[PDB]
Design a protein around this ligand. Structure first.
Ligand SMILES: CCCCCCCCCCCCCCCCCC(=O)OC[C@H](COP(=O)([O-])OCC(O)COP(=O)([O-])OC[C@@H](COC(=O)CCCCCCCCCCCCCCCCC)OC(=O)CCCCCCCCCCCCCCCCC)OC(=O)CCCCCCCCCCCCCCCCC
Ligand SMILES: CCCCCCCCCCCCCCCCCC(=O)OC[C@H](COP(=O)([O-])OCC(O)COP(=O)([O-])OC[C@@H](COC(=O)CCCCCCCCCCCCCCCCC)OC(=O)CCCCCCCCCCCCCCCCC)OC(=O)CCCCCCCCCCCCCCCCC
Ligand SMILES: CCCCCCCCCCCCCCCCCC(=O)OC[C@H](COP(=O)([O-])OCC(O)COP(=O)([O-])OC[C@@H](COC(=O)CCCCCCCCCCCCCCCCC)OC(=O)CCCCCCCCCCCCCCCCC)OC(=O)CCCCCCCCCCCCCCCCC
Ligand SMILES: CCCCCCCCCCCCCCCCCC(=O)OC[C@H](COP(=O)([O-])OCC(O)COP(=O)([O-])OC[C@@H](COC(=O)CCCCCCCCCCCCCCCCC)OC(=O)CCCCCCCCCCCCCCCCC)OC(=O)CCCCCCCCCCCCCCCCC
Ligand code: HEA
Ligand code: HEA
Ligand SMILES: CCCCCCCC/C=C\CCCCCCCC(=O)OC[C@H](COP(=O)(O)OCCN)OC(=O)CCCCCCC/C=C\CCCCCCCC
Ligand SMILES: CCCCCCCC/C=C\CCCCCCCC(=O)OC[C@H](COP(=O)(O)OCCN)OC(=O)CCCCCCC/C=C\CCCCCCCC
Ligand SMILES: [O-][O-]
Ligand SMILES: [Cu+2]
Ligand SMILES: [K+]
Ligand SMILES: [Zn+2]
Ligand SMILES: [Zn+2]
Lengths: 47, 49, 459, 107, 121, 65, 50
């Protein structure tokens, strides 16, 4: 509904429509893949 | 006919007779460096991948 | 002489010098923005002078893109080393090289003069009509600057393409990076000129393209048909630099040279056909949206191959060599930072995610991480690598671990919170905002003042 | 992919039992900012700079051949800082092949 | 395992300790590190080990700190960042006692798993 | 000539006049002023003040200062 | 402790590495060739056996 202080709200917050829920879950679905892509690559940044 | 170049007329960079007798040794070191390089490539590729 | 010089290496120095000068104006504008956004209220801009903020954000974007980073990464480092990398005496077109830098300076003077003399209003750096065509004369002046800049960019692109005819050695990856950017410019600029002329026609010639029965969405197609190729015209030279630095400093031959080259070619072709991911919220047809979303995600493949080829360059390097040199640190930092920017780009590429994140500060943080952090650091790293060849001194940068650490920490303090407020949500191109978004905006503002202070320590 | 030069076992056989790998230092030396003398004028400071080029340095091996300062790219081959005119004599990229012609030899 | 199974023409050190040596070092001073593991003044060359006598390919390893402080030094004599320590002493120990290595790795992973899961959950 | 071998020989040989550096920094300083001076001028033109007082466009407590 | 040493000695024996199947075309070292290099060579990372 309205922004609240010091909230991460990663991927969205307070959906009030089925489409709004879809948007939040699409981001949540891809987020672990993004973490994998980052962690897997960064771990090899070294001599 | 083409112009001819004679290598026997080229002045050479200065090298002492002591240095000239070590040519085989330096070549020997170079081969061992290439052998160690090639083997290490396989070793490192396996470790890091 | 100074202005008459045709030496390609001197002109390269001029490009870097001018980028830093114009860059001072760019950074100042950025400080104004962040100061204003420190809390809710008016801080340094009156509510009756809100048009100035709109002009500040517009000029910030335009100057940093076309007058700072592009002249620095495509004009500065390229004009200095490309003829050397090509084992050629000098650049193919000497007189054209001279006029290009003069043109850039003259267009800069026009822009800043328009700040002083014209009424200050803004329409974004994307100059969307009808807003751009109902404005005052400052918009006309900005259009003249862009067109003039376009002339310099195209002639410089012609100059680099001619190296293929004279190159006496091997086309290294960096040379390939510049050539492809030149191709991207030759194909994208003529379209930009056309749409800019149409903006002028509506502003100055009573044309009616951007009034009812004329589609305003037309502008966005032609603009972004140049817009996105521009973001790769700005990043590809940076990639070329990163390749040289990693290979040289680690004493390791580039791995997958041909894949690096073919990755750059691929990014260009794909980057020329994905522009409408900037137009997701206009209301395009379902199949168009799916095409553009699909092709946009494909760009990650070639971009990913380059990243992993860079990583193996740093892996396995000798431990005895000192790794604290600023150039090496910046090159490594680029990989770490670019992945963040690219991944967030893939997130916004999904159109349904984009509906929530369009015109929000998440987009800001995305392109800042790539440009304000990645591109800047790449240009710094490239100049630092060539410090001996260029010969500049009177700075403490070459070995300064404090500068690198402070820059990395504080730059992330500015833009990481901008990802958070993107789901809060705080729109872009605004100055006032709700009181519940102050915390994150305040943190980013503290980051901006700190970064500026660190820029003074180099001297 | 490149994996070094190929070695035949015959080439790894020493001519003496005491042969080991030559321990020659390939660190060129200790350096810093080039330090110009106050007395030197512009011309003589140019000579000083030209005599401090690392890319003109080398390491001499036990047989008298020298391994030069080498780089992957020709950017490191010009004088530092770069002079106005660098590659007056075209740099030569040497390619190798197995082709030969009789005129080059004599019996 | 480069010296053990791959290459037989590099000198092979003896492990003095499977733990780093902690020493205080001063900037502007040069230190010499034992690369054979037989010196009695570890981690430094004592003048009587292989390194000091230049025997069997062993030579002292020159090292110099940038700043004063306490630095960890390699006891296993095989760390990649030798003379400094980077964890290779533990790695080389696992090669020599693979059963012990598993115990420590399981314990470390167990703690890491619990903490990260407890905080995120 | 030896003096002409290096581009910008005086600067590279560390003999250049410092005024050249001062002009470069001054030019950058002037460029920066193009963002601040019009801000002050525009604020005064539309308000009568060169710079606002934080939150002076909102309702303030009686003791606010 | 007896079982501890037993399993420790059982694991150790099984893990002792066998010579690598080189995936590269290198020569055979001449017979009777000892240590030729020195410890000042660039360090080669110590890698665990598979
Ligand atoms: C009734 C009327 C009827 C009709 C009449 C119609 C008439 C029609 C006429 C048509 C023609 C008119 C035009 C004629 C042009 C003639 C050109 C020519 O042939 O000149 C030969 C002539 C050769 O001179 P010379 O007689 O041999 O001797 C020259 C001297 O010895 C000096 O020797 P030098 O050349 O070696 O020295 C030059 C140099 C010497 O160097 C220095 O001064 C010190 C070193 C540099 C310091 C650091 C500067 C900052 C870094 C810049 C980096 C990029 C540089 C790029 C290259 C330079 C580009 C200018 O310094 C400069 O002069 C300029 C330096 C750069 C200034 C700009 C830097 C950025 C500042 C940004 C500030 C704001 C933010 O050229 C020149 O030397 C001067 C050319 C001047 C052109 C000026 C054009 C300026 C345009 C500005 C914008 C205009 C719009 C807005 C203006 C608003 C004003 C309020
Ligand atoms: C038993 C211990 C482990 C317990 C846990 C195990 C869990 C299961 C793992 C799988 C099985 C493991 C089995 C290992 C057995 C040993 C095998 C072996 O060969 O042993 C010898 C071998 C080493 O032997 P050696 O090579 O002979 O020499 C000994 C040396 O010690 C040489 O050692 P080294 O070089 O291998 O040292 C390891 C070092 C090697 O790697 C490095 O040092 C690389 C560090 C590069 C850092 C670059 C700067 C990054 C700064 C980014 C800041 C971004 C700010 C802005 C973000 C904006 C976002 C919007 O690893 C790290 O430092 C960890 C880096 C991990 C990735 C870092 C990035 C995390 C990102 C998290 C998500 C972020 C999301 C938001 C961002 C955007 C997402 C799209 O040991 C290992 O392989 C040890 C690996 C240890 C891994 C520990 C990972 C801990 C950190 C986790 C992530 C952080 C968050 C945690 C909560
Ligand atoms: C992003 C920032 C941070 C970056 C950090 C990272 C940096 C990493 C490293 C980057 C390195 C890049 C590569 C560097 C290569 C350098 C090569 C080089 O040195 O070339 C030699 C080149 C020239 O040396 P040279 O060969 O001996 O040249 C001899 C001359 O050609 C001949 O000598 P001359 O004496 O005969 O010269 C002629 C001279 C003759 O000069 C004089 O006679 C001067 C007399 C004194 C005047 C002083 C100024 C007075 C101002 C008064 C203002 C009054 C305001 C009143 C207000 C009242 C209000 C109520 O000048 C002129 O006649 C023309 C001057 C034109 C240019 C200056 C323009 C100033 C601004 C004008 C604005 C106008 C706005 C108008 C608006 C109108 C609107 C209607 O060097 C320079 O030009 C200086 C470069 C210095 C910096 C080099 C880089 C160092 C490393 C970076 C440091 C950080 C910089 C940060 C940016 C600046 C921040 C502010
Ligand atoms: C219950 C316990 C069971 C224990 C079974 C142990 C089996 C074992 O280790 O066999 C090794 C054993 C060798 O024994 P050894 O006596 O030490 O002989 C070694 C010789 O020197 C020479 O041996 P060789 O010449 O026959 O070659 C063997 C060597 C040849 O090695 C190579 O050529 C390298 C192999 C690794 C390459 C990996 C490349 C990855 C590239 C990634 C690229 C993309 C990155 C970016 C991705 C971005 C995505 C967004 O193999 C390895 O090094 C294998 C390393 C292990 C590979 C594991 C791959 C899957 C991951 C498994 C993780 C651990 C899971 C534990 C689960 C526990 C239960 C929860 O092999 C054999 O007996 C036949 C082979
Ligand atoms: C140089 C600058 C630059 C670069 C490189 C990019 C790169 C990318 N950008 Fe761009 N972008 C901008 C600058 C840039 N962008 C700017 C300035 C804007 C805003 C303009 C405005 O609106 O005014 C913008 C806007 C923008 C939007 C608009 C969002 C909105 O308007 O709401 C989108 C969405 O499609 C997008 C997507 C992408 C993608 C998908 C990439 C890809 O190139 C990213 C590719 C990289 C990776 C993917 C990471 C590396 C690869 C791997 C680690 C391999 C593994 C990863 C996967 C398999 C996914 N960008
Ligand atoms: C590459 C271009 C570039 C660069 C460097 C930056 C740098 C910065 N930008 Fe950026 N910014 C844009 C391009 C850029 N920006 C664009 C295109 C927009 C959108 C415009 C629009 O909305 O219309 C934008 C918008 C934008 C906004 C949004 C205002 C709004 O529309 O509401 C904000 C503030 O939040 C901001 C802040 C900053 C800050 C704090 C920095 C930096 O100050 C962070 C700190 C980093 C430094 C101070 C180093 C920079 C140094 C150089 C650039 C010189 C390099 C020269 C050499 C190495 C020779 N930027
Ligand atoms: C680089 C050179 C090649 C570029 C080719 C780009 C073609 C991309 C195809 C995109 C696509 O499907 O086009 C749809 C899209 C419009 O979609 P909607 O507005 O939703 O309208 C559809 C029905 N009303 O088409 C366009 O905008 C095409 C624009 C013309 C591109 C012309 C390029 C010319 C290059 C020379
Ligand atoms: C105080 C703000 C920062 C001032 C500053 O650093 O200015 C530096 C800059 C360059 O000076 P040096 O680096 O010492 O160059 C001369 C040769 N070594 O100084 C000036 O330009 C002096 C005038 C500054 C006016 C600012 C308004
Ligand atoms: O723009 O990506
Ligand atoms: Cu785009
Ligand atoms: K505000
Ligand atoms: Zn010893
Ligand atoms: Zn150790």
């Amino acid at each position: 509904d309205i922004p609240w202080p010091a909230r991460t709200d990663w991927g969205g917050h307070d959906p009030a429509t089925p489409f709004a829920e879809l948007m939040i879950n699409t981001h949540s679905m891809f987020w672990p893949v993004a973490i994998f892509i980052y962690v897997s690559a960064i771990y090899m940044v070294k001599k | 006919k083409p112009l001819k170049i004679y290598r026997s007329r080229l002045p050479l960079p200065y090298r002492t007779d002591e240095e000239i007798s070590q040519e085989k040794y330096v070549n020997w070191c170079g081969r061992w460096y290439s052998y160690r390089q090639r083997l290490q490539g396989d070793y490192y590729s396996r470790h890091y991948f | 002489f100074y202005i008459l010089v045709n030496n390609n290496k001197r002109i390269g120095i001029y490009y870097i010098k001018l980028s830093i000068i114009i860059g001072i104006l760019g950074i100042v504008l950025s400080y104004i923005i962040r100061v204003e956004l420190y809390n809710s209220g008016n801080r340094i801009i009156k509510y009756d002078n809100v048009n100035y903020y709109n002009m500040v954000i517009t000029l910030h974007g335009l100057l940093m893109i076309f007058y700072i980073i592009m002249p620095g990464l495509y004009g500065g480092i390229p004009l200095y080393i490309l003829p050397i990398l090509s084992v050629i005496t000098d650049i193919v077109l000497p007189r054209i090289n001279n006029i290009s830098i003069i043109i850039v300076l003259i267009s800069y003077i026009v822009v800043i003069n328009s700040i002083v003399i014209e009424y200050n209003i803004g329409t974004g750096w994307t100059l969307y009509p009808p807003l751009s065509i109902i404005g005052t004369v400052i918009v006309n002046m900005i259009l003249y600057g862009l067109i003039i800049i376009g002339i310099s960019s195209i002639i410089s692109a012609i100059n680099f393409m001619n190296i293929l005819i004279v190159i006496d050695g091997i086309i290294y990856v960096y040379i390939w990076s510049i050539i492809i950017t030149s191709v991207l410019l030759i194909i994208s600029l003529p379209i930009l000129n056309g749409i800019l002329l149409m903006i002028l026609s509506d502003i100055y010639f009573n044309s009616i393209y951007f009034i009812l029965n004329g589609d305003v969405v037309l502008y966005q197609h032609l603009f972004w048909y140049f817009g996105h190729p521009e973001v790769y015209i700005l990043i590809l030279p940076a990639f070329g630099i990163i390749s040289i630095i990693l290979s040289v400093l680690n004493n390791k031959i580039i791995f997958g040279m041909k894949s690096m080259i073919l990755a750059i070619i691929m990014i260009s072709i794909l980057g020329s056909i994905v522009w409408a991911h900037h137009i997701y919220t206009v209301g395009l047809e379902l199949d168009t949206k799916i095409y553009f979303n699909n092709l946009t995600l494909i760009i990650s493949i070639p971009t990913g191959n380059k990243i992993y080829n860079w990583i193996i360059l740093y892996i396995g390097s000798y431990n005895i060599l000192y790794n604290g040199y600023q150039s090496l640190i910046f090159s490594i930092m680029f990989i770490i930072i670019f992945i963040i920017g690219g991944i967030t780009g893939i997130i916004i590429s999904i159109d349904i995610i984009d509906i929530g994140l369009h015109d929000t500060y998440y987009i800001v943080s995305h392109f800042h991480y790539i440009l304000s952090i990645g591109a800047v650091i790449s240009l710094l790293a490239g100049i630092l690598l060539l410090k001996d060849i260029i010969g500049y001194y009177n700075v403490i940068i070459k070995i300064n671990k404090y500068f690198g650490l402070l820059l990395f920490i504080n730059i992330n303090i500015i833009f990481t919170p901008q990802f958070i407020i993107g789901f809060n949500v705080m729109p872009r191109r605004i100055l006032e905002y709700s009181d519940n978004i102050i915390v994150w905006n305040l943190i980013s503002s503290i980051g901006s003042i700190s970064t500026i202070l660190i820029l003074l320590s180099i001297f | 992919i490149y994996e070094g030069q190929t070695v035949q076992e015959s080439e790894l056989i020493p001519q003496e039992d005491d042969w080991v790998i030559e321990e020659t230092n390939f660190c060129l030396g200790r350096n810093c900012y080039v330090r110009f003398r106050e007395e030197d004028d512009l011309a003589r400071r140019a000579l000083h700079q030209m005599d401090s080029q690392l890319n003109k340095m080398h390491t001499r091996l036990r047989d008298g051949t020298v391994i030069p300062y080498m780089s992957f790219h020709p950017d490191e081959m010009v004088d530092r800082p770069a002079p106005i005119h660098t590659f007056s004599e075209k740099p030569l990229l040497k390619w190798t092949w197995d082709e030969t012609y009789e005129e080059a030899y004599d019996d | 395992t480069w010296t053990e199974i791959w290459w037989e023409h590099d000198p092979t050190p003896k492990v003095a300790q499977y733990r780093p040596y902690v020493c205080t070092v001063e900037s502007g001073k040069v230190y010499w590190w034992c690369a054979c593991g037989e010196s009695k003044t570890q981690p430094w060359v004592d003048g009587h080990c292989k390194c000091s006598k230049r025997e069997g390919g062993f030579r002292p390893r020159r090292w110099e700190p940038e700043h004063d402080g306490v630095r960890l030094f390699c006891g296993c004599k095989s760390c990649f960042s030798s003379p400094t320590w980077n964890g290779g002493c533990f790695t080389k120990w696992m090669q020599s006692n693979p059963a012990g290595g598993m115990l420590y790795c399981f314990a470390a992973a167990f703690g890491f798993g619990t903490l990260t899961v407890y905080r995120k959950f | 000539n030896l003096e002409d071998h290096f581009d910008l020989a005086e600067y590279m040989m560390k003999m250049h006049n410092p005024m050249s550096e001062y002009l470069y920094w001054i030019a950058g300083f002037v460029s920066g002023l193009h963002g601040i001076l019009p801000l002050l001028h525009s604020n005064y033109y539309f308000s009568g003040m060169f710079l606002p007082r934080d939150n002076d466009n909102t309702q303030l407590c009686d003791d606010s200062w | 402790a007896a079982v501890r040493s037993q399993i420790e000695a059982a694991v150790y024996k099984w893990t002792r590495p066998r010579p690598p199947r080189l995936g590269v075309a290198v020569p055979r070292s001449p017979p009777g060739t000892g240590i030729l290099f020195h410890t000042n060579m660039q360090t080669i990372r110590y890698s665990l056996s598979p």
